[PDB]
């Protein structure tokens, strides 16, 4: 549908802003220079809101995801496959806004982990994983049925 | 395969906890 397609084209700006604000807030509590680089756009506000409201629960899982990603050993060659299978298994049960933010958070954690392990210049490739998965696995469609990404601005705590 | 399932399970747990903690603004 046309609404699904608009949402899927907005995901890149949402994910890029989410990555920026999430990294900035964790740094203010080693930096990834690829994450430090329009802010008043509705999609930029959405990414920032979702970084803010997930902060407390994301912190509780930091140690688990660090251990699991070390075990997974993602590389340039297997990261598409691992990201897709992980994201597919996440949504097998269903979709709600928390799981959508968990997907964005997984793209953030994956991008950060591979950079810290020496895979440079990869953030754009993770962004494409997130955008393409949401289009092709009905996540953008669910978001369109909520009224688009702007509906996430009305999530609080 | 075992690591993929563990990671996806944690994402679902974290996402469901986030979803339960959020209301309207
Ligand atoms: Cu655990």
Technique behind this structure? X-ray
Domains in chain A with CATH codes: 2-154 (1.10.437.10)
| Torsional class of A31: left (φ above 0), alpha (ψ -120 to 50), beta (otherwise) | beta
- Given the structure tokens 């997984």, which residue do they identify? A106
For this entry, resolution in Å reads 1.9
Instruction: Take residue A146 and report the two structure tokens written for it.
Output: 């909520």
Rg (CA), chain B: 12
Under 8 Å between Cβ of A7 and A144? yes
Instruction: Take residue A128 and report the two structure tokens written for it.
Output: 């494409």
Q: Which residue does chain B place closest to A56, by CA atoms?
A: B18
Provide the 8-state DSSP code for A154: G
Closest CA to A1 of A126, A141, A111, A128: A141
Alpha carbon distance A17, A1 (integer Å) = 25
Residue A113 assigned as binding residue: no
Query: Are the Cβ atoms of A90 and B8 closer than 8 angstroms?
Result: yes
Tally of CB atoms within 10 A around A114: 22
């Amino acid at each position: 549908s046309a609404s699904e397609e608009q949402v899927a084209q907005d995901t890149e700006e949402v994910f890029r802003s989410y990555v920026f604000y999430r990294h900035q807030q964790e740094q203010e509590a080693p930096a990834d220079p690829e994450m430090v680089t329009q802010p008043s756009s509705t999609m930029g506000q959405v990414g920032r809101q979702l970084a803010i409201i997930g902060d407390d629960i994301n912190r509780r899982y930091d140690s688990e995801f660090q251990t699991m990603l070390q075990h997974l050993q993602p590389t340039a060659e297997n990261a598409y496959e691992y990201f897709t299978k992980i994201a597919t298994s996440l949504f097998e049960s269903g979709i709600n806004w928390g799981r959508v933010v968990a997907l964005l958070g997984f793209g953030y954690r994956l991008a950060l982990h591979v950079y810290q392990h020496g895979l440079t210049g990869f953030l754009g490739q993770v962004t494409r994983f997130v955008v393409d998965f949401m289009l092709h696995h009905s996540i953008a469609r669910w978001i369109a049925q909520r009224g688009g990404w702007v509906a996430a601005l009305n999530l609080c705590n | 395969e075992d690591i993929i399932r563990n990671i996806a399970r944690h994402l679902a747990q974290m996402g469901d906890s986030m979803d339960r903690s959020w209301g309207g603004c």
